[PDB]
């Protein structure tokens, strides 16, 4: 394998002797050169572990590195300052000051210019992180909400132009807000030029996807493949009009890119650099679990998949240090955490905590939640969880069967209950969600519906508002970067047109993808409305989280409350949080609190709480007690 010095000499060969001398003395090159030496070894090692002695590895690497230099050279000065800042502050992601929000530009603000006008609200809310859903060109009609990309360079015309996106990102930076977008690197739409040219037999795009002559291999692969959208098609393949079959983990119009082809890595690395120079701070690595296939395996979380992401990481460490990755692996907890690392994905969605928040509301028992916060919360240094309550996607019950078994709980039976409860098919349920992808051959099913709809706000359940504040309080204080599903802060309900919409009716996730509700937002400052109660409640926790250093970092120590309905944990050995998941008053005995100070200030209610006597929490009450 070649080394950093050798490759750098060849990168400079594109310059005339006179030009070369000038480049080598420039600041840009000095920085690039330094980063090459520091991070190239990792890049080479990761790529070698995946491609081995492939003849195209060296040629691809030099092409990519030449691109990396040009990209860094062109990179805007303001972005390079951010590169330096984060390069010397890897834990910026762990700061309690961070609070993120996510929205669809079209649903929330119409278009990019309209989004730009919403920035003042984002600052009002206190956001320092804004994640925007798929913005680029995609097939008209069904595109899996923009996740079927037909062009990584051209913005969806309905949203604006690439120029408007640049302006938006710069406006967010001016407002002290980081820009976060998806890096849909596991697949493209079947209308993408690469897909068309590959299928057409263009030699320049040979093996860019996984195409087969018949069902021989697809049937073999399907013996071990998990079905993501069983409603759309069985297994992981779709048939082309000409009779061939293509690997399609998700919708039939989404073709899995073939990373076993080094030129695919190079191609996508190029797209990553493009986004990088737009000033994107964080890239949501869509479907990281599926980027490597191997017959006989689930084709999820394979070693090469992890290696490739680490290879991508190195490319950013070299040509755009400010760009961090956000893993979005919704898989077994043991696999989820493997994507999180300083040299892989610095942050990642925490589906375990999210799924258990909802589980606890249904069961009223914090057992599983406590277990998770105790054994699966702390992460390696320089990494953090992205804690959330809801997202653009359905809710999956991704807790570990092995973990549940320890608690005497049958995963299969328990999920059946949860699914029934949240789709209002369980006596007394307050949830008003709808099913998603019920799989008759496995019994699996997921849930769609907004946070407000799932807690009973649709029917005006008197506990609805408190439930919302309770869930968000935990995502906001356990340690990690909290990501609010914009619209939740005012109690937005399900969209009630999706089921009638020809392009959405077969995807219930659209139920929880409502448009900006002018009426609810207009009530955010009115304490007598649910919108106001929710907004002020959440805004206060946001204010406290960001100004109080006791919430800093991502580490926590659980506290045994001795009450199966109350969750408890301590941050920095100075903040004791209690959360009552019961609709009835619940007590934490004075005996249980003997090690605590006689009195402590509750940052939530603002009152002084006595801990030398039984502490009774009202239904769904949350307390953030300063014990130090």
Ligand X SMILES: OC[C@H]1O[C@H](O[C@H]2[C@H](O)[C@@H](O)[C@@H](O)O[C@@H]2CO)[C@H](O)[C@@H](O)[C@@H]1O
Ligand Y SMILES: OC[C@H]1O[C@H](O[C@H]2[C@H](O)[C@@H](O)[C@@H](O[C@H]3[C@H](O)[C@@H](O)[C@@H](O[C@H]4[C@H](O)[C@@H](O)[C@@H](O)O[C@@H]4CO)O[C@@H]3CO)O[C@@H]2CO)[C@H](O)[C@@H](O)[C@@H]1O
Q: Name the residues that contact ligand X, by CB under 6 A.
A: 559-560, 562, 592, 594-595
The Cα–Cα gap between 178 and 385 comes to 17
With respect to ligand X, which residue has the nearer C-beta, 370 or 545?
A: 370
Contact 312, 269 (CB under 8 A): yes
Given the complex with ligand Y, which of 212 and 426 has the nearer CB atom? Answer: 426
Rg (CA), the chain: 25
296 binds ligand Y (CB under 6 A): no
- 361 interacts with ligand Y by CB under 6 A: no
DSSP state for residue 618 in the 8-state scheme: P
The dihedral formed by the CA atoms of 309, 296, 442 and 446, expressed in degrees to the nearest 10: 10
By CB under 6 A, residue 364 contacts ligand Y: yes
Smallest distance from ligand X to CB 38, Å = 42
Contact 215, 234 (CB under 8 A): no
Closest chain position to ligand X (CB): 560
Contact partner, 192, from ligand X, ligand Y, none, Cβ < 5-8 Å per class: none
The whole-angstrom separation of Cα 468 and Cα 473 is 8
Edge-to-edge, what's the strand order for the sheet holding 575-580?
A: 557-558, 566-571, 575-580, 622-626, 599-602, 608-610
From candidates 417, 439, 463, 557, binder to ligand Y by CB under 6 A = 417
Query: Cβ-closest residue to ligand Y?
Result: 413
- Residue 21's Cβ-count burial label (10 Å; 0-12, 13-18, 19+) is exposed
Provide the 8-state DSSP code for 209.
Answer: B
CB 268 within 8 A of CB 152: no
Q: What, of ligand Y, ligand X, none, does residue 478 touch, CB below 5 to 8 Å by kind?
A: none
Task: Please give the size of the binding site for ligand Y, defined by CB under 6 A.
Answer: 11
The entry of ligand X, ligand Y, none near residue 364 (CB within 5 to 8 angstroms by kind) is: ligand Y
Closer residue to ligand Y in complex, CB, 228/409: 409
DSSP states along 87-143: HT-GGGGG-TT--EEEE-HHHHHSSHHHHHTTHHHHHHHT-SEEEEP--B---SS-S
Q: Is 381 in the site for ligand Y (CB under 6 A)?
A: no
Q: What are phi and psi of 570, to 5 degrees?
A: -120, 135
Closest separation in Å from C-beta 145 to ligand X: 43
Among ligand Y, ligand X, none, the one that 562 touches (CB under a kind-dependent 5 to 8 A) is: ligand X
Closest approach, Cβ 397 to ligand Y, in A, equals 11
Instruction: Classify each residue of 174-201 as buried b or exposed e, where b means 16 or more C-beta atoms within 10 Å of its C-beta.
Output: eeebbbbbbbbbbbbbbbbebbeebbee
CB of 562 to ligand X, least distance (A): 5
> Among residue numbers 559 through 588, which ones bind ligand Y (CB under 6 A)?
583
d(CA 289, CA 335): 9
Q: Which is nearer to ligand X, 128 or 561 (CB)?
A: 561
123 or 573, CB closer to ligand X? Answer: 573
Binding flag, residue 539, ligand Y (CB under 6 A): no
Q: How far is the CB of 362 from ligand Y (least distance, A)?
A: 6
Residue 98 binds: one of ligand X, ligand Y, none (C-beta under 5 to 8 A by kind): none
Q: With CB under 6 A as the contact rule, which of the stretches 46-54, 82-90, 345-353, 411-419 interacts with ligand Y?
A: 411-419
Q: How many helices (H) and strands (E) does the chain have?
A: 22, 23
Comparison of 208 and 620: residue with beta carbon closer to ligand Y = 620
Report, in Å, the least distance between residue 564 CB and ligand X: 13
Counting contacts by CB under 6 A, is residue 117 touching ligand Y? Answer: no
Judged by CB under 6 A, the residue of 353, 360, 363, 561 near ligand Y is 363
Question: Is residue 371 close enough to count as binding ligand Y by CB under 6 A?
Answer: no
Measured from the CB atom, the residue of 448 and 558 that comes closer to ligand X is 558
Cα separation, 128 vs 182, in Å, equals 17
Residue 595's binding partner out of ligand X, ligand Y, none, with CB under 5 to 8 Å set by partner kind: ligand X
| Sign for the pseudo-dihedral over CA of 522, 527, 528, 532 | positive
Distances (CA, A) of 556 to 356, 366, 478, 568: 17, 16, 7, 10
With CA atoms as reference, report the closest residue to 64 among 90, 46, 86. 46
Compute the least distance from the CB of residue 471 to ligand Y, in Å. 16
Closer by beta carbon to ligand Y, 417 or else 438: 417
State the nearest-atom distance from the C-beta of 560 to ligand X, in Å.
Answer: 3
Taking phi over 0 as left and psi of -120 to 50 as alpha, with beta for the rest, 146 belongs to left
Nearer Cβ to ligand Y, position 171 or 409?
409
Q: Does 521 bind ligand Y (CB under 6 A)?
A: no
Query: Is residue 428 close enough to count as binding ligand Y by CB under 6 A?
Result: yes
Binding partner of 594, given ligand X, ligand Y, none, CB within 5-8 angstroms per partner class = ligand X
Could you say which of ligand X, ligand Y, none residue 413 binds, taking C-beta under 5 to 8 angstroms by partner kind?
A: ligand Y
| Residue 402 touching ligand Y (CB under 6 A) | no
| Binding footprint of ligand Y on the chain (CB under 6 A) | 362-365, 409-410, 413-414, 417, 428, 583
């Amino acid at each position: 394998s070649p080394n950093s010095q050798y490759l750098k000499t060849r990168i400079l060969d594109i310059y005339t002797p006179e030009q070369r001398a000038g480049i080598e003395k420039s600041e840009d090159w000095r920085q690039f050169s330094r980063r090459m030496d520091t991070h190239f070894p990792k890049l080479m090692n990761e790529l070698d572990s995946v491609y081995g002695n492939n003849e195209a590895l060296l040629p691809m690497l030099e092409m990519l590195l030449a691109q990396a230099w040009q990209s860094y050279s062109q990179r805007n000065s303001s972005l390079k300052d951010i590169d330096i800042a984060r390069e010397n502050n890897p834990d910026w992601i762990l700061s309690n000051k961070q609070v993120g929000g996510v929205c669809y530009v079209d649903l929330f603000a119409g278009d990019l210019k309209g989004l730009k006008d919403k920035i003042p609200y984002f600052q009002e809310l206190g956001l320092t992180y804004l994640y925007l859903m798929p913005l680029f060109k995609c097939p008209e009609g069904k595109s899996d909400g923009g996740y079927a990309v037909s062009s990584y360079r051209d913005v969806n015309p309905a949203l604006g132009t690439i120029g408007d996106l640049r302006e938006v990102i710069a406006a967010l930076h001016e407002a002290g807000i980081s820009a976060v977008v998806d890096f849909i690197f596991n697949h493209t739409s079947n209308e993408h030029e690469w897909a068309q040219r590959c299928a057409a037999g263009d030699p320049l795009f040979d093996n860019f996807y996984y195409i087969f002559p018949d069902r021989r291999m697809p049937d073999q692969y399907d013996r071990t493949l998990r079905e993501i959208f069983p409603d759309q098609h069985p297994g992981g393949f779709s048939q082309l009009e000409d009779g061939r079959w293509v690997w399609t983990t998700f919708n039939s119009f989404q073709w899995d890119l073939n990373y076993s082809n080094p030129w695919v890595f190079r191609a996508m690395a190029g797209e990553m650099l493009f986004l990088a120079n737009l000033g994107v701070d964080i890239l949501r690595m869509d479907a990281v679990a599926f980027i490597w296939k191997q017959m006989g395996t689930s084709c999820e979380n394979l070693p090469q998949a992890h290696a490739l992401i680490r290879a991508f990481n190195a490319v950013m460490r070299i040509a755009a240090p400010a760009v961090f990755f956000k893993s979005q692996a919704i898989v077994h907890p043991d696999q989820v955490v493997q994507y999180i690392g300083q040299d892989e994905c610095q942050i990642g969605y925490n589906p375990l905590q999210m799924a258990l928040l909802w589980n606890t509301l249904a069961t009223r028992e914090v057992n599983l939640l406590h277990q998770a916060l105790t054994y699966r919360h702390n992460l390696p240094e320089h990494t953090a969880w992205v804690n959330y309550v809801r997202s653009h996607d359905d809710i999956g019950w991704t807790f570990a069967d092995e973990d549940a078994a320890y608690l005497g709980i049958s995963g299969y039976d328990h999920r059946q209950f949860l699914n029934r409860f949240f789709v209002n098919r369980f006596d007394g349920s307050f949830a008003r969600g709808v099913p998603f992808q019920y799989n008759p051959s496995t019994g699996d099913c997921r849930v769609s519906g907004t946070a407000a709809a799932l807690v009973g706000l649709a029917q005006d359940d008197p506990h609805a508002v408190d439930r919302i504040k309770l869930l968000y309080s935990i995502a906001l204080s356990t340690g990690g970067l909290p990501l609010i599903y914009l619209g939740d802060e005012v109690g937005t309900l399900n969209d009630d047109d999706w089921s009638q919409d020809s392009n959405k009716s077969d995807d219930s996730r659209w139920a929880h993808r409502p448009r900006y509700n002018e009426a609810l937002y207009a009530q955010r400052n009115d304490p007598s409305t649910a919108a106001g109660q929710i907004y002020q409640g959440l805004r206060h926790m946001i204010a406290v989280r960001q100004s109080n250093p006791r919430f800093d970092g991502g580490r926590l120590v659980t506290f045994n409350t001795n009450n199966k309905h109350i969750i408890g944990y301590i941050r920095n050995n100075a903040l004791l949080a209690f959360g009552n998941f019961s609709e009835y008053p619940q007590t934490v005995t004075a005996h249980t609190l003997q090690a605590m100070p006689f009195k402590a200030h509750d940052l939530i209610g603002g009152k002084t709480v006595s801990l030398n006597q039984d502490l009774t929490l009202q239904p769904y009450q949350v307390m953030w007690l300063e014990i130090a």
